[PDB]
Amino acid sequence: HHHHHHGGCRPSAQSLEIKHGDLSINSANNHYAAQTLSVSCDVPANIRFMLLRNTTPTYSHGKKFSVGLGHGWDSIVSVNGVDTGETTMRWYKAGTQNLTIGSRLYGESSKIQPGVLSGSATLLMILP
Amino acid sequence: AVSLDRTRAVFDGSEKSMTLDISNDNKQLPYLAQAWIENENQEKIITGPVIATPPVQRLEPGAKSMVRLSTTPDISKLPQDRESLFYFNLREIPPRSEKANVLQIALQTKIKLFYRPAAIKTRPNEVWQDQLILNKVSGGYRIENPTPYYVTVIGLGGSEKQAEEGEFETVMLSPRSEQTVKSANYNTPYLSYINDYGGRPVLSFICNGSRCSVKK
């Protein structure tokens, strides 16, 4: 409490695991799942949120950010409803706001393939 | 899951090292925390002159820990009458996951790390940002930073409220430099900047001709 020495932002603590369930009674391509986290800041803040691709996509999605999930499948990963790989949230005052990461499966048919899906991305928070 | 205690770090060159607190706020799972340093050009640097240790550590559920920042002898080669810029990076590595059909997201944080040589050590809550000068230019202001510190300007408006909530393209001025900024012309400019603590004070400027300085 010694003047918390520093103003800070802290994201929500939950595991960020966007679950597409069993792809068996829908076994879907345009499948969507999401996870919302919150970020609580002590001070005003800008945070630039940037998705970093770890696993490479099978297809090209132009300016839409994607990650490969393996076999024939990609995920277009959105943040606060933006597919483009970047968003900025702004706090004028201390408070908390939500950030939603969405995952939309994409698979062709030619390149497709039967097995389990698994992918990863990094959400980078850049503070000025 | 793994949070950092600050939005920027100031390394006091009077000291050989400092620590940043980190917390695994997830009470169910362990996370690794990767820490590393980048230079002013965002090149990852691993042998100094500023180093972060440990590069990776595991945090049990709920655990707090630390990252230690220290300098190598070659820190002496940096200028000693102004700050130098580095970036501190923290990336979490979550476990598993053992569920089928999942997209896993890891959080990473990138904050500014200011190496502040001993000669320009500051008193707590010292304010140098009121030394900024605004030059009226076609389409905005050229802001002069005559101080030995990096200054981050996050707002510029015609009122205090507009300095805080107005749309502005953040600019960081290097020590003893100047940068031109796009802006409406303001009869009485108000500027918001980010201090060591991470807060945003507002400064009121007065203009005479093409030059505005902090109302004293």
PDB file of C-alpha atoms in Angstrom, chain B residues 3-215:
ATOM      1  CA  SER B   3       1.193 -10.477 -14.167  1.00  0.00           C
ATOM      2  CA  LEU B   4       3.873  -7.864 -13.863  1.00  0.00           C
ATOM      3  CA  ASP B   5       3.951  -5.161 -11.156  1.00  0.00           C
ATOM      4  CA  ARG B   6       4.510  -2.105 -13.427  1.00  0.00           C
ATOM      5  CA  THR B   7       3.960  -0.577 -16.915  1.00  0.00           C
ATOM      6  CA  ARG B   8       7.530   0.658 -17.213  1.00  0.00           C
ATOM      7  CA  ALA B   9      10.814   0.049 -15.444  1.00  0.00           C
ATOM      8  CA  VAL B  10      13.427   2.590 -14.428  1.00  0.00           C
ATOM      9  CA  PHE B  11      16.898   1.156 -13.820  1.00  0.00           C
ATOM     10  CA  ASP B  12      18.824   3.383 -11.473  1.00  0.00           C
ATOM     11  CA  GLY B  13      22.433   3.142 -12.648  1.00  0.00           C
ATOM     12  CA  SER B  14      23.609   3.781  -9.064  1.00  0.00           C
ATOM     13  CA  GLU B  15      22.697   0.173  -8.421  1.00  0.00           C
ATOM     14  CA  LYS B  16      24.039  -3.038  -9.790  1.00  0.00           C
ATOM     15  CA  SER B  17      20.616  -4.675  -9.949  1.00  0.00           C
ATOM     16  CA  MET B  18      16.928  -4.375  -9.308  1.00  0.00           C
ATOM     17  CA  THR B  19      13.997  -6.673  -9.217  1.00  0.00           C
ATOM     18  CA  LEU B  20      10.534  -6.744 -10.802  1.00  0.00           C
ATOM     19  CA  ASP B  21       7.771  -8.684  -9.029  1.00  0.00           C
ATOM     20  CA  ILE B  22       5.669 -11.150 -10.970  1.00  0.00           C
ATOM     21  CA  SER B  23       2.712 -13.188  -9.873  1.00  0.00           C
ATOM     22  CA  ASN B  24       1.086 -16.327 -11.086  1.00  0.00           C
ATOM     23  CA  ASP B  25      -2.446 -15.267 -10.404  1.00  0.00           C
ATOM     24  CA  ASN B  26      -3.822 -18.571 -11.669  1.00  0.00           C
ATOM     25  CA  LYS B  27      -4.526 -20.703  -8.562  1.00  0.00           C
ATOM     26  CA  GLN B  28      -5.066 -23.947 -10.427  1.00  0.00           C
ATOM     27  CA  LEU B  29      -2.081 -24.248 -12.821  1.00  0.00           C
ATOM     28  CA  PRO B  30       1.646 -23.713 -12.951  1.00  0.00           C
ATOM     29  CA  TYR B  31       3.056 -21.342 -15.605  1.00  0.00           C
ATOM     30  CA  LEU B  32       6.521 -20.681 -16.852  1.00  0.00           C
ATOM     31  CA  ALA B  33       7.568 -17.086 -17.015  1.00  0.00           C
ATOM     32  CA  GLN B  34      10.099 -16.133 -19.723  1.00  0.00           C
ATOM     33  CA  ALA B  35      11.879 -12.842 -19.247  1.00  0.00           C
ATOM     34  CA  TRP B  36      14.322 -11.147 -21.605  1.00  0.00           C
ATOM     35  CA  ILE B  37      15.711  -7.813 -22.606  1.00  0.00           C
ATOM     36  CA  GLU B  38      15.629  -5.968 -25.919  1.00  0.00           C
ATOM     37  CA  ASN B  39      17.604  -2.850 -26.843  1.00  0.00           C
ATOM     38  CA  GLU B  40      16.279   0.425 -28.170  1.00  0.00           C
ATOM     39  CA  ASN B  41      15.852  -1.163 -31.641  1.00  0.00           C
ATOM     40  CA  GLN B  42      13.991  -4.137 -30.223  1.00  0.00           C
ATOM     41  CA  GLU B  43      16.833  -6.526 -30.823  1.00  0.00           C
ATOM     42  CA  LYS B  44      16.979  -9.203 -28.243  1.00  0.00           C
ATOM     43  CA  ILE B  45      20.148  -8.927 -26.295  1.00  0.00           C
ATOM     44  CA  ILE B  46      21.442 -11.798 -24.185  1.00  0.00           C
ATOM     45  CA  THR B  47      24.952 -10.835 -23.035  1.00  0.00           C
ATOM     46  CA  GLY B  48      24.289  -7.300 -21.797  1.00  0.00           C
ATOM     47  CA  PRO B  49      24.702  -4.530 -21.032  1.00  0.00           C
ATOM     48  CA  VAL B  50      21.377  -5.184 -19.268  1.00  0.00           C
ATOM     49  CA  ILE B  51      20.397  -8.723 -18.520  1.00  0.00           C
ATOM     50  CA  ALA B  52      17.327 -10.387 -17.016  1.00  0.00           C
ATOM     51  CA  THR B  53      17.563 -13.476 -14.848  1.00  0.00           C
ATOM     52  CA  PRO B  54      16.316 -16.119 -14.825  1.00  0.00           C
ATOM     53  CA  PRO B  55      15.426 -16.323 -18.507  1.00  0.00           C
ATOM     54  CA  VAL B  56      12.737 -18.877 -17.561  1.00  0.00           C
ATOM     55  CA  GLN B  57      11.231 -19.935 -14.281  1.00  0.00           C
ATOM     56  CA  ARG B  58       8.268 -21.999 -13.208  1.00  0.00           C
ATOM     57  CA  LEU B  59       5.634 -20.532 -10.972  1.00  0.00           C
ATOM     58  CA  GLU B  60       3.485 -22.889  -9.075  1.00  0.00           C
ATOM     59  CA  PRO B  61      -0.206 -22.134  -8.803  1.00  0.00           C
ATOM     60  CA  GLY B  62      -0.611 -18.832  -6.983  1.00  0.00           C
ATOM     61  CA  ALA B  63       3.110 -18.244  -6.540  1.00  0.00           C
ATOM     62  CA  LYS B  64       4.871 -14.888  -6.517  1.00  0.00           C
ATOM     63  CA  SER B  65       8.317 -14.388  -7.701  1.00  0.00           C
ATOM     64  CA  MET B  66      10.756 -12.051  -9.247  1.00  0.00           C
ATOM     65  CA  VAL B  67      12.909 -11.144 -12.159  1.00  0.00           C
ATOM     66  CA  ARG B  68      16.273  -9.630 -11.512  1.00  0.00           C
ATOM     67  CA  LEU B  69      17.719  -7.052 -13.842  1.00  0.00           C
ATOM     68  CA  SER B  70      21.426  -6.329 -13.731  1.00  0.00           C
ATOM     69  CA  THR B  71      24.133  -4.726 -15.710  1.00  0.00           C
ATOM     70  CA  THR B  72      27.336  -5.901 -17.275  1.00  0.00           C
ATOM     71  CA  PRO B  73      30.604  -3.895 -17.140  1.00  0.00           C
ATOM     72  CA  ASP B  74      29.904  -2.703 -20.694  1.00  0.00           C
ATOM     73  CA  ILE B  75      27.036  -0.650 -19.233  1.00  0.00           C
ATOM     74  CA  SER B  76      29.831   1.977 -18.793  1.00  0.00           C
ATOM     75  CA  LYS B  77      29.905   2.430 -22.565  1.00  0.00           C
ATOM     76  CA  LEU B  78      26.381   3.915 -22.520  1.00  0.00           C
ATOM     77  CA  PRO B  79      26.044   7.672 -22.351  1.00  0.00           C
ATOM     78  CA  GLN B  80      26.142   8.844 -18.778  1.00  0.00           C
ATOM     79  CA  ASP B  81      24.372  12.139 -19.040  1.00  0.00           C
ATOM     80  CA  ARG B  82      21.057  10.737 -20.543  1.00  0.00           C
ATOM     81  CA  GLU B  83      18.837   7.649 -20.405  1.00  0.00           C
ATOM     82  CA  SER B  84      19.192   4.751 -22.724  1.00  0.00           C
ATOM     83  CA  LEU B  85      16.178   2.685 -23.826  1.00  0.00           C
ATOM     84  CA  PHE B  86      15.602  -0.995 -23.390  1.00  0.00           C
ATOM     85  CA  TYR B  87      12.495  -3.149 -23.295  1.00  0.00           C
ATOM     86  CA  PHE B  88      11.605  -5.759 -20.707  1.00  0.00           C
ATOM     87  CA  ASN B  89       9.590  -8.678 -21.988  1.00  0.00           C
ATOM     88  CA  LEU B  90       7.594 -11.222 -20.036  1.00  0.00           C
ATOM     89  CA  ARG B  91       5.965 -14.164 -21.707  1.00  0.00           C
ATOM     90  CA  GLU B  92       3.974 -16.815 -19.946  1.00  0.00           C
ATOM     91  CA  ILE B  93       3.963 -20.435 -20.994  1.00  0.00           C
ATOM     92  CA  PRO B  94       0.825 -22.277 -19.931  1.00  0.00           C
ATOM     93  CA  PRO B  95       0.839 -25.997 -19.424  1.00  0.00           C
ATOM     94  CA  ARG B  96      -0.564 -28.857 -21.560  1.00  0.00           C
ATOM     95  CA  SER B  97      -3.287 -28.490 -22.722  1.00  0.00           C
ATOM     96  CA  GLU B  98      -4.706 -32.023 -22.865  1.00  0.00           C
ATOM     97  CA  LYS B  99      -8.129 -31.159 -24.354  1.00  0.00           C
ATOM     98  CA  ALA B 100      -8.937 -31.910 -27.941  1.00  0.00           C
ATOM     99  CA  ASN B 101      -9.598 -29.145 -30.453  1.00  0.00           C
ATOM    100  CA  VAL B 102      -8.242 -26.140 -28.560  1.00  0.00           C
ATOM    101  CA  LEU B 103      -6.604 -22.909 -29.425  1.00  0.00           C
ATOM    102  CA  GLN B 104      -4.290 -21.931 -26.640  1.00  0.00           C
ATOM    103  CA  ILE B 105      -3.333 -18.313 -26.026  1.00  0.00           C
ATOM    104  CA  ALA B 106      -0.317 -17.195 -24.046  1.00  0.00           C
ATOM    105  CA  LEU B 107       0.051 -13.607 -22.780  1.00  0.00           C
ATOM    106  CA  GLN B 108       3.182 -11.562 -23.340  1.00  0.00           C
ATOM    107  CA  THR B 109       4.004  -8.125 -22.069  1.00  0.00           C
ATOM    108  CA  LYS B 110       6.396  -5.569 -23.405  1.00  0.00           C
ATOM    109  CA  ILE B 111       7.301  -2.573 -21.307  1.00  0.00           C
ATOM    110  CA  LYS B 112       9.831   0.209 -21.576  1.00  0.00           C
ATOM    111  CA  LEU B 113      12.945  -0.153 -19.442  1.00  0.00           C
ATOM    112  CA  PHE B 114      14.787   3.110 -18.941  1.00  0.00           C
ATOM    113  CA  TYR B 115      18.435   2.915 -18.016  1.00  0.00           C
ATOM    114  CA  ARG B 116      18.966   5.987 -15.963  1.00  0.00           C
ATOM    115  CA  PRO B 117      22.644   6.690 -15.308  1.00  0.00           C
ATOM    116  CA  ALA B 118      23.638   7.673 -11.799  1.00  0.00           C
ATOM    117  CA  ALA B 119      24.462  11.260 -12.730  1.00  0.00           C
ATOM    118  CA  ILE B 120      20.769  11.961 -13.658  1.00  0.00           C
ATOM    119  CA  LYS B 121      19.253  10.042 -10.739  1.00  0.00           C
ATOM    120  CA  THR B 122      15.989  11.609  -9.732  1.00  0.00           C
ATOM    121  CA  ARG B 123      14.293  12.464  -6.454  1.00  0.00           C
ATOM    122  CA  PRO B 124      11.120  10.591  -5.858  1.00  0.00           C
ATOM    123  CA  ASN B 125       8.234  12.256  -7.695  1.00  0.00           C
ATOM    124  CA  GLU B 126      10.610  14.713  -9.406  1.00  0.00           C
ATOM    125  CA  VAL B 127       9.043  16.401 -12.429  1.00  0.00           C
ATOM    126  CA  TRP B 128      11.091  17.279 -15.491  1.00  0.00           C
ATOM    127  CA  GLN B 129       8.303  16.995 -18.003  1.00  0.00           C
ATOM    128  CA  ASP B 130       7.293  20.608 -17.344  1.00  0.00           C
ATOM    129  CA  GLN B 131      10.462  21.514 -19.252  1.00  0.00           C
ATOM    130  CA  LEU B 132       8.877  20.500 -22.533  1.00  0.00           C
ATOM    131  CA  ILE B 133       8.467  23.326 -25.082  1.00  0.00           C
ATOM    132  CA  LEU B 134       5.833  23.378 -27.818  1.00  0.00           C
ATOM    133  CA  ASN B 135       6.620  24.967 -31.263  1.00  0.00           C
ATOM    134  CA  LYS B 136       3.650  25.915 -33.423  1.00  0.00           C
ATOM    135  CA  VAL B 137       4.055  24.270 -36.830  1.00  0.00           C
ATOM    136  CA  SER B 138       2.035  23.637 -39.906  1.00  0.00           C
ATOM    137  CA  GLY B 139      -0.499  21.056 -38.824  1.00  0.00           C
ATOM    138  CA  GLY B 140       0.622  20.674 -35.199  1.00  0.00           C
ATOM    139  CA  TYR B 141       3.466  21.157 -32.755  1.00  0.00           C
ATOM    140  CA  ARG B 142       7.118  20.424 -32.645  1.00  0.00           C
ATOM    141  CA  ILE B 143       7.766  19.331 -29.085  1.00  0.00           C
ATOM    142  CA  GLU B 144      11.267  19.836 -27.701  1.00  0.00           C
ATOM    143  CA  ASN B 145      12.533  17.601 -24.972  1.00  0.00           C
ATOM    144  CA  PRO B 146      15.620  19.246 -23.520  1.00  0.00           C
ATOM    145  CA  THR B 147      15.770  16.895 -20.565  1.00  0.00           C
ATOM    146  CA  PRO B 148      18.041  13.889 -20.216  1.00  0.00           C
ATOM    147  CA  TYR B 149      14.983  11.593 -19.964  1.00  0.00           C
ATOM    148  CA  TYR B 150      12.756   9.832 -22.456  1.00  0.00           C
ATOM    149  CA  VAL B 151       9.430  11.646 -22.313  1.00  0.00           C
ATOM    150  CA  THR B 152       6.197   9.877 -23.358  1.00  0.00           C
ATOM    151  CA  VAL B 153       3.452  12.245 -24.472  1.00  0.00           C
ATOM    152  CA  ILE B 154       0.076  10.587 -24.531  1.00  0.00           C
ATOM    153  CA  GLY B 155      -2.267  13.536 -24.885  1.00  0.00           C
ATOM    154  CA  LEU B 156      -2.426  17.012 -26.301  1.00  0.00           C
ATOM    155  CA  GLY B 157      -5.565  19.085 -26.400  1.00  0.00           C
ATOM    156  CA  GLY B 158      -7.118  22.466 -25.945  1.00  0.00           C
ATOM    157  CA  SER B 159      -8.547  21.550 -22.599  1.00  0.00           C
ATOM    158  CA  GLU B 160      -7.553  19.317 -19.742  1.00  0.00           C
ATOM    159  CA  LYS B 161     -10.315  16.877 -20.596  1.00  0.00           C
ATOM    160  CA  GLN B 162      -9.214  16.752 -24.215  1.00  0.00           C
ATOM    161  CA  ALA B 163      -5.577  16.141 -23.154  1.00  0.00           C
ATOM    162  CA  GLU B 164      -6.866  13.086 -21.239  1.00  0.00           C
ATOM    163  CA  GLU B 165      -9.565  11.728 -23.544  1.00  0.00           C
ATOM    164  CA  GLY B 166      -8.758  13.224 -26.900  1.00  0.00           C
ATOM    165  CA  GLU B 167      -7.426  11.090 -29.666  1.00  0.00           C
ATOM    166  CA  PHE B 168      -3.685  11.403 -29.939  1.00  0.00           C
ATOM    167  CA  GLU B 169      -0.892   9.481 -31.475  1.00  0.00           C
ATOM    168  CA  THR B 170       1.456   8.647 -28.605  1.00  0.00           C
ATOM    169  CA  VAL B 171       4.988   9.955 -29.095  1.00  0.00           C
ATOM    170  CA  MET B 172       8.057   9.285 -27.037  1.00  0.00           C
ATOM    171  CA  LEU B 173      10.766  11.903 -27.168  1.00  0.00           C
ATOM    172  CA  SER B 174      14.338  10.761 -26.676  1.00  0.00           C
ATOM    173  CA  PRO B 175      16.548  12.738 -24.337  1.00  0.00           C
ATOM    174  CA  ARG B 176      17.486  16.165 -25.757  1.00  0.00           C
ATOM    175  CA  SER B 177      15.489  15.788 -28.931  1.00  0.00           C
ATOM    176  CA  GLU B 178      12.490  17.123 -30.707  1.00  0.00           C
ATOM    177  CA  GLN B 179       9.621  15.683 -32.539  1.00  0.00           C
ATOM    178  CA  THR B 180       6.800  17.063 -34.629  1.00  0.00           C
ATOM    179  CA  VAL B 181       3.322  16.130 -33.665  1.00  0.00           C
ATOM    180  CA  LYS B 182      -0.025  16.426 -35.620  1.00  0.00           C
ATOM    181  CA  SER B 183      -2.581  18.556 -33.828  1.00  0.00           C
ATOM    182  CA  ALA B 184      -5.265  21.179 -34.052  1.00  0.00           C
ATOM    183  CA  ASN B 185      -4.036  24.576 -32.925  1.00  0.00           C
ATOM    184  CA  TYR B 186      -4.855  25.355 -29.349  1.00  0.00           C
ATOM    185  CA  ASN B 187      -5.072  28.678 -27.683  1.00  0.00           C
ATOM    186  CA  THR B 188      -4.103  27.142 -24.404  1.00  0.00           C
ATOM    187  CA  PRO B 189      -2.495  23.708 -25.007  1.00  0.00           C
ATOM    188  CA  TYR B 190      -2.805  20.996 -22.417  1.00  0.00           C
ATOM    189  CA  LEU B 191      -0.408  18.068 -22.511  1.00  0.00           C
ATOM    190  CA  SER B 192      -0.535  14.708 -20.763  1.00  0.00           C
ATOM    191  CA  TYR B 193       2.609  12.608 -20.207  1.00  0.00           C
ATOM    192  CA  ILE B 194       3.396   9.270 -18.437  1.00  0.00           C
ATOM    193  CA  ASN B 195       5.610   9.452 -15.391  1.00  0.00           C
ATOM    194  CA  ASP B 196       7.895   6.905 -13.734  1.00  0.00           C
ATOM    195  CA  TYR B 197       4.986   5.526 -11.711  1.00  0.00           C
ATOM    196  CA  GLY B 198       2.892   4.977 -14.822  1.00  0.00           C
ATOM    197  CA  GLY B 199       0.378   7.728 -14.098  1.00  0.00           C
ATOM    198  CA  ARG B 200      -0.590  10.640 -16.466  1.00  0.00           C
ATOM    199  CA  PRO B 201      -0.324  14.089 -15.135  1.00  0.00           C
ATOM    200  CA  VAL B 202      -1.580  17.008 -17.205  1.00  0.00           C
ATOM    201  CA  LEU B 203       0.360  20.149 -17.839  1.00  0.00           C
ATOM    202  CA  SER B 204      -1.077  23.550 -18.838  1.00  0.00           C
ATOM    203  CA  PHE B 205       0.917  25.534 -21.476  1.00  0.00           C
ATOM    204  CA  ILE B 206       0.929  29.257 -22.347  1.00  0.00           C
ATOM    205  CA  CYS B 207       1.940  30.474 -25.754  1.00  0.00           C
ATOM    206  CA  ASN B 208       3.881  33.513 -26.955  1.00  0.00           C
ATOM    207  CA  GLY B 209       4.068  33.562 -30.691  1.00  0.00           C
ATOM    208  CA  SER B 210       5.227  30.227 -32.068  1.00  0.00           C
ATOM    209  CA  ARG B 211       6.368  28.949 -28.632  1.00  0.00           C
ATOM    210  CA  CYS B 212       4.422  27.508 -25.685  1.00  0.00           C
ATOM    211  CA  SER B 213       5.857  26.677 -22.308  1.00  0.00           C
ATOM    212  CA  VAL B 214       4.412  25.464 -19.101  1.00  0.00           C
ATOM    213  CA  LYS B 215       2.422  27.995 -17.283  1.00  0.00           C
TER     214      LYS B 215
END
